[PDB]
Amino acid sequence: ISVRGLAGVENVTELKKNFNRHLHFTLVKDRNVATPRDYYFALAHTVRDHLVGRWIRTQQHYYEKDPKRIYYLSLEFYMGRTLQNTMVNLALENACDEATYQLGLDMEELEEIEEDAGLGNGGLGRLAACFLDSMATLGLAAYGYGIRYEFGIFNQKICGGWQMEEADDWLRYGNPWEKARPEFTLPVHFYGRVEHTSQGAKWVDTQVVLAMPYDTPVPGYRNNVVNTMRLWSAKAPNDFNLKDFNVGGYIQAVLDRNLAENISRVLYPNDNFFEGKELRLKQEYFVVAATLQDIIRRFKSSKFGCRDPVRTNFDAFPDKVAIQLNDTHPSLAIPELMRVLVDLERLDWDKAWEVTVKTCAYTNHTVIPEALERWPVHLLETLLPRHLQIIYEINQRFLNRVAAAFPGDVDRLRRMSLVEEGAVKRINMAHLCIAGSHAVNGVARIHSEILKKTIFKDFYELEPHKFQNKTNGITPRRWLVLCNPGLAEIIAERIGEEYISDLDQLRKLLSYVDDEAFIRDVAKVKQENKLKFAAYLEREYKVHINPNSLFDVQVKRIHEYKRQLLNCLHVITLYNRIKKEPNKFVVPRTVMIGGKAAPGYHMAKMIIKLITAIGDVVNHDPVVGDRLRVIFLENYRVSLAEKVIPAADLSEQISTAGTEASGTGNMKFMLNGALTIGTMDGANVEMAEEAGEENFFIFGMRVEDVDRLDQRGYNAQEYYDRIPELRQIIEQLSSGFFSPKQPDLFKDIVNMLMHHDRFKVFADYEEYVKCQERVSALYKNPREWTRMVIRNIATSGKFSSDRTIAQYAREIWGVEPSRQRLPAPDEKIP
Amino acid sequence: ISVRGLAGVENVTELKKNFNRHLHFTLVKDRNVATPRDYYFALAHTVRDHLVGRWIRTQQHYYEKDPKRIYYLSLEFYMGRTLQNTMVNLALENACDEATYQLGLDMEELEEIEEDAGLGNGGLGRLAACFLDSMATLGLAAYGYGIRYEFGIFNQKICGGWQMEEADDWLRYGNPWEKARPEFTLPVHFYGRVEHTSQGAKWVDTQVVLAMPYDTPVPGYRNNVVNTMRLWSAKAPNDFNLKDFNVGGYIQAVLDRNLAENISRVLYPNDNFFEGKELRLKQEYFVVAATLQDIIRRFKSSKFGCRDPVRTNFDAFPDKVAIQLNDTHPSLAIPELMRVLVDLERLDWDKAWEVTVKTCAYTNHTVIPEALERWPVHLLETLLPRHLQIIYEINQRFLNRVAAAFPGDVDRLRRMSLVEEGAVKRINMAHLCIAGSHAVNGVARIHSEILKKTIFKDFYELEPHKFQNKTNGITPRRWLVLCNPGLAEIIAERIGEEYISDLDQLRKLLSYVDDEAFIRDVAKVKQENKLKFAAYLEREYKVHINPNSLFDVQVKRIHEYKRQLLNCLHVITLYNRIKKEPNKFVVPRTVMIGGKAAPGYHMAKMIIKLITAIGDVVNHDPVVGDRLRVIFLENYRVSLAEKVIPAADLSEQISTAGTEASGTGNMKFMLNGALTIGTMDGANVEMAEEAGEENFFIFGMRVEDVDRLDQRGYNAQEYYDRIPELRQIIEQLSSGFFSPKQPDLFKDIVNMLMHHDRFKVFADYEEYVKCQERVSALYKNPREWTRMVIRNIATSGKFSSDRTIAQYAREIWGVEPSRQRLPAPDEKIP
Ligand SMILES: O=c1[nH]cnc2c1ncn2[C@@H]1O[C@H](COP(=O)(O)O)[C@@H](O)[C@H]1O
Ligand SMILES: O=c1[nH]cnc2c1ncn2[C@@H]1O[C@H](COP(=O)(O)O)[C@@H](O)[C@H]1O
Ligand SMILES: NN1C(=O)N[C@@]2(O[C@H](CO)[C@@H](O)[C@H](O)[C@H]2O)C1=O
Ligand SMILES: NN1C(=O)N[C@@]2(O[C@H](CO)[C@@H](O)[C@H](O)[C@H]2O)C1=O
Ligand SMILES: *Cc1c(COP(=O)(O)O)cnc(C)c1O
Ligand SMILES: *Cc1c(COP(=O)(O)O)cnc(C)c1O
């Protein structure tokens, strides 16, 4: 059937009876009233049974051996569905497929019923998920720590061409994967004041919110390791949230508990944008405070909570603990670790600071200013008074370091301060992370260099040793074996299965680049993938596409820096050229644009409307026929990505050079047989470098050119003046060609494009359509297109998150990865 | 060990491995980290497994045979713990005891970990629970329908002698008994307006709240019948509760969902008191609207949703459906049933009314005016506009009936109206229930007569056939076999086990009233019970009592009509007599008073303070010694009741004649070997009548005497003037003898007692202490006390809820009870 494992005789039988046990005993249903949703749950529970045994021994193991623990703190974990992924990592896919078949059910139909765990916005959240899978696969004692939002990223609905947001109640029917651990509930403080008494400061008169943990299993790939993702939920204490007496109302007091519990209710839908709301800051301290107590507790036990030197010496803390800050979101972990060590454990400042710097590491994910976290001091002052005091003291000491290193450099001092003066004083979270971490890293080679040369130049001059790079990657498991079994099988037919956990081995496919059967096969799976997606489209969304055309897709969050608008300009150009010479042949294309816009991002929502507006015109023009279709992919999410990416021919990664930190979608397309058209931005550079620029479609300004243009001054009118085709499009938008009933509908886009384009869309227009002509030319030659595809796939190995994690492990965390199978799952009950 | 069933070889082994399966697979724990709470859950899950098989076949059975269905609507279901009860009804107690013993665990210790399902206030809620158990035991196709509050009756804490209320988060660790059924979620409407168009009225522009059902199993006693209790939970729709666009905030919209979900958040803590809050009215319509849709759906399928006459003829509705209104709380079911039949199904008014009256029945539980539900019209007008219109039309037609029957009786017309004019117009819910039901019943013979003679006299003259009586009862399972296995065993040793489901057989114990061994045994179990309670007391609450003294207990909600104050007056009298003649012998007593006061009931909370104040003085007076102890039983609830009642010698049922509708605690004490001192009120009359007045300690005014006194006018000063002992107590309270630091602390009590005592406490004082002397005299003669006890126990059979339900079944619902074992639980998987 494929190498989705063995469909053993004893195990298919075993699976079937357990499926039935659960349908009866767990779901309390009988075959005569069971619906597909019930069947999905029976299976889910049956599969989950197979990893509890391993989950328990993995955790017990780490307790016995006591290795250095890795704590990945992130406010986002974009997990997606977990049924198939679990089957894949446990080699259970074919057995389950067989068994459910024998029970007369279609497994694929059941898999479609599982709701996505959308606890993320985009790249940042998905990176965390990929990392977790890799850390488990490489046998690291790692823990993912985050917030269990009851409402994840909103589900997007297109009404009249506009995006409509609606609550993502992903828990409505329950989550069979999580395990509530109310017994490990912890208290988290807010507000209050600071008392300075005799021997130390005291954080007093605080409001208490309880953090209840929920553990979800993270299985490694076929190695019997099952790590843990611990998500915190906010709960109100039953005392003060009722007991602070003297009139108000008993009923009202009980209803008001949903005020402390609102902390974990919803994820902020902002991608690469900072909103200084109090609720967000509360979420940030909440995850940090709860997690740290859990970390220290585990450390207090270790082998120190037995003997060792005997005296809670936190000197070995950094040798046993490593906490990674996914962006500045969990940045309060720094002053919080200090508060506990100094205020509660009573360590002197300097010893505490040494420990803190040695255990914390920070990862930066963007250079755009509006995404930078700068919290107003009056907010921290009210909500976390002691932390503010600690931050000021950290700043005081750090700046003294600077003064000593650069005597008399008074501007450098203000530039480097963690405290920003002006309208309202703010705390630069990024500056805090750099000062309190022993390593700072970018997510792509160019991004990392940009940090050193630009944004964090002064900090680099101060401590050059802190700055590193760790190019992002994706998991070959979910992003290849899971979503594209067809491609995985044909690769395995030639080079084996060891590449799934050693992606570099894909290089061996280079020697099949002239193999006639392989070229035919690679081309076949892609055709099968396109046919399946074209079908899904009519199934779930309804109104035809042509599977023979080139599948041109751009799927990622809607942003001005991602330039979906530049993609739009090209689409309209194709249309206009067709309308000019109707009877001239052109390579057919289905351009699919999908992504979500943050609710308050007006421009982004305007762009979504533009895309659907273009499709209204283009898709109903008889002269165009089936040569050009414009489709907006609704509710883009992880599960939808697993469907489009394997069916894509052209991947669009056209951000303005220097704005996309790394990107990861690009890597997903490369490993799945799509050719890439893009700019020398983020990881695109390393991808072209790995596959050879001849096998990549690069165009546009490089970072240097962008800067040259900024010195000069960017004037879009120039481009409008010298390119008639560009002029024609802008006047089409301006006159209502794309919006008849509301002719001035797109005035904001045009106005922006002509007067305040921060991402110089026009500057890359000419070179973009010129480059687009080149890919069309090559698509006309199936054999050569596929051969270039094989050059990309065969060379994408470097982009596996296993590589990324192994680097973090060795160069930052100080631990050694291991592909050693944990001693089976085997029963056991001590 | 006792007749807690057989501890079979095959089943103890089976139990043990399933206990282990769950500890591993369900709880995801290993013996080395498992806590008593984990062990409790493993067991709970193991026991729950045994009744799913029966639950499924019972429900399937009713679907096949299609009998008349009974729907018990109540806003309260005081269930208590459910582990032991389930073991008892499934004959699993000894097997579980053995198995857990073999696993090295104490079952009793684990049972103490289960949280009480406190979804009730007192008697009314507990009656519903007892009824459910009886309906399942008598093989009736009955369904309990209510609200799944996430916060039940508050947990009571005594701080400085005052009651402190704190949220009862009973779901904190989860509920292993319930089964969420998100797939049967239903929509419920609120607000909106009424459109009168061509062919009918339309309820339009409403706010939608979703009702998600949770089913809990209700096993009959050893008959394999497992009925269902369906509790509704409020959920916000994800559309409008987000989709009603045009600025407000996406985050805020999501946080505001906890506005529609507040409907099922907390139970109103009022016992016998009406609070006209909007949230309450919403809860009332919520449970009614959701339930009715469920009822009709089931009816539409029946055997009509196949064939029968073919044409949705609702003429057979009353033959297939019976809905019982537990008090007026679910009274909206009447106009709601009309709204659906008329507005949606399009039946003419008269046919709809005939159906409605024929399927609904109402049970009244109190005669005090302040407990009567009178909803302001402006509230119904805004929240349920169409229902108000229906109520007015029902009133219009009903009053025309009256006018026709009593021509010219203009005062009768206003008196009987469902609409009350005055300050603000109100709707008399009780009047609505009588008009729209074919049966109205009281809960005790005297209470029922009072309804006919007083409160509902006019309605009785109009339709005498509607009025009936159904004396309350309690379940011998939880209230005898479960809480008092020792007594149950010795009874079973002489007369067998058939009495558990046929309590009348207890009469056979009359012939052992002179049996020397039996008297010794009855006396022994009571001594063992007192020793165990005396121990629990020091265990969980701490500060000694004497097990040899007479256990004088009064446990019920704190009310002015229950007269805990009269009990107080007696206690103080005993104290004063001891202080007057210290070296004179008196029968030792431990008087235990326990109960909760509604949060806003100032007087009730003042009484709690008085009780603890008396104990402070009495319990620390050296001259008193161990002759007199005053203890306030904290957090009285079902589980606590199962502990005190079996250990009680004297039961206090001293409400003012004519105020306690029936009472059920009194019955609990009678069947557990306690002697009763009380007034001729509620069921006390039928109890004395059943056991013989010679075996009861009756005192005080009868209903007649109370009325005579009211004609005359009640003047408490008279009693104060003629009784020196009474005078001495009032002046002790007035001068601060019981409250040194705050001498005027109890001025409200004294003031009330002397000038506004609605329950004439002083009037029954003399006859009360005189009667108390008589019980002390009899306690001095152990042999005769026990013999009188045997006379009570042997004669309590009439007070089993099996009798009550059989009467409802035959005289109101029109169904026949059956003690037929359902065809085993046996596997099966169709
Ligand atoms: O005190 C202990 N005795 C034995 N095993 C322990 C103890 N503490 C932790 N463990 C084991 O280590 C696992 C790790 O628990 P953690 O504290 O959540 O990391 C637990 O599930 C147990 O298997
Ligand atoms: O359409 C049907 N076919 C077969 N069995 C049914 C059907 N509807 C209800 N049942 C059975 O009747 C039980 C009663 O379901 P209820 O509607 O919740 O009362 C179900 O759990 C099934 O066993
Ligand atoms: N939202 N979001 C960011 O703020 N930064 C991002 O992080 C990911 C993961 O490192 C990078 O690949 C993206 O280029 C970057 O934009 C991202 O996706
Ligand atoms: N709260 N509450 C009432 O409002 N009425 C009550 O109902 C129960 C059950 O019928 C009766 O036994 C009580 O006497 C009556 O007070 C009761 O306990
Ligand atoms: C991989 C992924 C992303 C990141 O895409 P980029 O193109 O790097 O912005 C965003 N959303 C989803 C659902 C993803 O799978
Ligand atoms: C039986 C019961 C009641 C009813 O007691 P009465 O004396 O009839 O008021 C109240 N509370 C609990 C916990 C009960 O078990």
Curated annotation (Swiss-Prot), chains A, B:
The record marks 143 as: Can be labeled by an AMP analog. It comes from Oryctolagus cuniculus. InterPro entries: Glycg_phsphrylas, Glyco_trans_35, Pyridoxal_P_attach_site. Phosphorylation of Ser-2 converts phosphorylase B (unphosphorylated) to phosphorylase A. It comes from the Eukaryota. The modification Phosphotyrosine is found at residues 191, 214, 460. This is Glycogen phosphorylase, muscle form. Homodimer. Homotetramer; to form the enzymatically active phosphorylase A. One of its GO terms (molecular function) is pyridoxal phosphate binding. It catalyses: [(1->4)-alpha-D-glucosyl](n) + phosphate = [(1->4)-alpha-D-glucosyl](n-1) + alpha-D-glucose 1-phosphate. CDD domains: GT35_Glycogen_Phosphorylase. Belongs to the glycogen phosphorylase family. AMP binds at residues 30, 63, 297-306. The record marks 96, 130 as: Involved in the association of subunits. Its cofactor is pyridoxal 5'-phosphate. The modification Phosphoserine is found at residues 2, 417, 501, 734-735. Keywords: Acetylation, Allosteric enzyme, Carbohydrate metabolism, Glycogen metabolism, Glycosyltransferase, Nucleotide-binding, Phosphoprotein, Pyridoxal phosphate, Transferase. The gene is PYGM. GO terms for cellular component: skeletal muscle myofibril. Its EC number is 2.4.1.1. Allosterically regulated through the non-covalent binding of metabolites, being activated by AMP and inhibited by ATP, ADP, and glucose-6-phosphate. The activity is also controlled by post-translational modifications including phosphorylation. NCBIfam families: P_ylase. GO terms for biological process: glycogen catabolic process.
